[PDB]
C-alpha cells in the first residue's frame, strides 16, 4: 500500500554519505525528526550495506528503499538488501517487469508527456518527476488536466521556501535532499522538523 | 488534409473545451463560436464526449469546425471519427493513432515537447505539431527550432492569456490553443471573453 | 506538569557520554527508539551545550532535563541552558529552594526513611530512589504503609529482566542508564525499543 | 576519436555559423579563426555546406578544426564525411547516424534534452552530448545530471552570451557552442566579438 504511505507521509529523505557509518547517523537524525520514508542512493560506493545496516529502523517504522537505480543488476542487489521500493530517473521495462514479478514497488522517472503516457501503459500511476527545478510546479498543475489519474513525486527545486507550492500544484509527496539532508546529525534533525511542520500546515 | 493548414492560419485560435456535463459543453461551444472562434475541439476528458461532438451539426453548417481533443488511444480516436470529428488532437506522439487517422483521411495533430520527439513526428509526415505544455518550454523553443526544423509549424496549448498571445505570434506560431483563459464562467462572459481574444490577435 | 509526563512515559533515559558529540548522537538514538524523557548528567563535557542544542527536539515532543546536579550553581547554570527538570543523587536544600523560586521541577535522591521524611516535609512528593540496585523493589513496597503518598523513580539495577518487577512494586517510572544508552547509536535505538516495548506489556 | 575530448576541453568554445552563400560562410569562418576560435561548425542548413567544408581546408592546415552541424540524416552525414568533416553534430539522437559514424570512425555528438534521452544515448557509447536548447533547460540541468550520470560531458548550444558564458562553466560544462551571439555581421565585427568570448572564458 505504498500510495497509502506516500500520501500519508508526504515527504521522502534522499540520503548520500561519505561512508556507511555516516549514512547511519544521518538516517537516525532524519527518522528522529519525523521523516519515515528514506531513499538510499545506489550509485555510491558501498550502498548495499547501508540499506542492510538500516534494518533496525524497519521495526521502528522506517521504510527504506533504493534510489538512483540505473541497471537491473543494481535493482536485484537492492532487493535482497531488503529495499522496499526502487526509484529510477528513466522508464526501464526490464526493471519494471522484474519488480512486478518480485513484488517490489517501482517509481519510474519522467519529464515529458510522451514519457508519462508510455509509463502509464505499463501500469504506473505514480511517477517521479525529474529534474524538478526544470519543469517546476506549473508542469504538475497542467498535466493534471489530460491525466487526472497520475500523481507525481518531484525531486529538486524543492525547499522550505516553496515546498507548499508543490502541494498546491497537486503532488502526492516531495523528495528532498541536501536542503533536508546535510551537515551534522544535530542540524539534520532540526531541518527534518521544520519541513514536516510546513508540510503539515499546507 | 492540407485544408487544415489554411483553416488554422486564417482563424489563429483554437478553443479547448472541458466540461463535466453534456449540457454545459454544448452551451459553452455555442458561446465560443458566437464570440468569433471557429476552431473548437471537444476533449475526451468529459462524460459522453462523443455525444457532444455529434449534437453540433448546426454549428458545422455555420462554418464552424468541430474536432476531438485529449485522444489517448485508437479506440477513442475511432469513436471521435465516427462521431463527426474533423480533426484529432493528442498530448503525445502515437504511431497507432497516426496510422489509423492516415487510413481514414482524418487530420491528426500529435504533441511534442523535445527536439527528438519533434524529429520522429516529422518523420511520419506531421508538419503541424502541438507544443505542450507551452508554459514549460515558452516562445524561445519555437524560435530555436526554426534552424534545424524550418518547415515545422507549432500550435502551443498551455498558458496562453490575453497578455502572452502577442509574444507567441511574433515567434512564428501558426495558431494558439486556449483553455480556461477562454472558456470559463457563464455563457455570457465566455462569448465576450472570446471576442477579446479574437480582437487582440488581430492587432498582433 | 512534569508529574503527569513521568506517569505517561514510564521511563527516563539517563545519558552520560564521554564527549559533547556522543551525548547528542545518543540522545537522538534514544529519542528515535521511543524515549521522550532524557536527562543529561553534568559529568558530560560541555553538558550545557548539549542541553541547549537539543532544544530543537522539544518541538518534536522531547523533554530535556539535567542530572547529577550536586550544587546550586550547577542547578542555576542548567535552568539557563533550558533544563526542564533537575535531578540530584542526594537531598540539597539550596537546590530545593532555588528550584522552588524558579518554578523548576526538582527530584532529590533518597535511600532511607529518615531522608524520605525530611525531603517530603520540604514539599517533594516524588523522590529518586538511589542506588536502586541496593534497596530493591522491596523498599518501594514497604514504604507504602507509612508513606502512602510518596512515589519513586528508581535509578540503577533496572534491566529488561526485572523492569516489570519495579512496576509491580508500584514505581512511577524507571530511570535507565548504561543498559539503555551504552553502545553505538544503531544499538542504542534498538535497546530503547524493547525497553519501551516490555514496559507497555506489564504496566 | 578519444582525441576529440582533449580538443574540446582545451578550446572550450565552438563557433556555429550559418550563411546564405559560400562566400559569407568562408569569411565568417576566417573571422572567428583570427578571433581565437579553432573549433568551427558548418551547418547543413546552408545550401552549399559541403563546398564550404571542402574549401576551408586551408584553415585545417593552420590548426583549425572544421566539422558539420545540423545533420539530420544519414545521407547528409555521408556527404559531410566525404567533404572532410572531422565531427558530426545533430539536434537529436539518431541511431542510424550513430552506427554510420561508428563504422566510418567519425566523432558523433547527438543532442539530448531529457534524462531518458541521456540514458539511451550513452547506451550507444556516447559520453559527450550536445544540450539543446540550452536556453530551455538551463545550467540547472547540467548540475542535476552530474549525479546519476557522473561521466557525462555536455556542450550546450543556444542560450550562451557573454553574460552567462561564466555561469555555464561553473556547472562543469565541457565546452559551449555559440551561435549568432558570436557570428553576426561583417568579419571585423565578428573577429572582435569572437575574441571577447575567448578573453572572458580565460577569466572564469
Author numbering:
A (entry chain B): 2 to 203
B (entry chain D), D (entry chain A): 20 to 223
C (entry chain C): 2 to 204
What does the paper say about this structure?
Docking this pentasymmetron against C3-symmetric homotrimers (‘CCC’) and designing novel sequences that create favourable interfaces between the B and C chains yielded models of 240-subunit nanocages with icosahedral symmetry. The original I3-01 nanocage can be thought of as T = 1, with one (A) subunit in the asu, while the pentasymmetron-containing 240-subunit nanocages are T = 4, with four (2×A, 1×B, 1×C) subunits in the asu. We determined a single-particle reconstruction of GI4-F7 at 4.4 Å resolution applying icosahedral symmetry and a 3.1 Å resolution structure of the 4 chains of the asu (cryo-EM processing details in Extended Data Fig. 3 and Extended Data Table 2). The cryo-EM structure agrees well with the design model, with a Cα root mean-squared deviation (r.m.s.d.) of 9.3 Å across all 240 subunits and 3.0 Å within the asu. The differences between the cryo-EM structure and design model are mostly accounted for by slight rigid-body deviations allowed by the limited degrees of freedom of the oligomeric building blocks in this symmetric architecture. The main rigid-body deviation is a 5.9° clockwise rotation of the pentasymmetron, accompanied by a 5.8 Å translation away from the origin. The CCC homotrimer compensates by rotating 12.4° and translating 4.0 Å, resulting in only slight local shifts relative to the design model (2.1 Å across the B:C subunits). Within the pentasymmetron, the degrees of freedom of the AAB heterotrimer are no longer restricted by the strict icosahedral symmetry of I3-01, resulting in a slight deviation from perfect two-fold symmetry between neighbouring A chains (1.4 Å Cα r.m.s.d.). As suspected, we observed backbone and sidechain rearrangements within each protomer that explained how the V118Y and P90F disrupting mutations were tolerated in the AAB heterotrimer.
Here, inspired by the pseudosymmetry observed in bacterial microcompartments and viral capsids, we developed a hierarchical computational method for designing large pseudosymmetric self-assembling protein nanomaterials. We computationally designed pseudosymmetric heterooligomeric components and used them to create discrete, cage-like protein assemblies with icosahedral symmetry containing 240, 540 and 960 subunits. At 49, 71 and 96 nm diameter, these nanocages are the largest bounded computationally designed protein assemblies generated to date. Here we show that designing pseudosymmetric protein building blocks, in which symmetry is broken at the sequence level while backbone symmetry is maintained, enables the construction of very large pseudosymmetric protein nanocages.
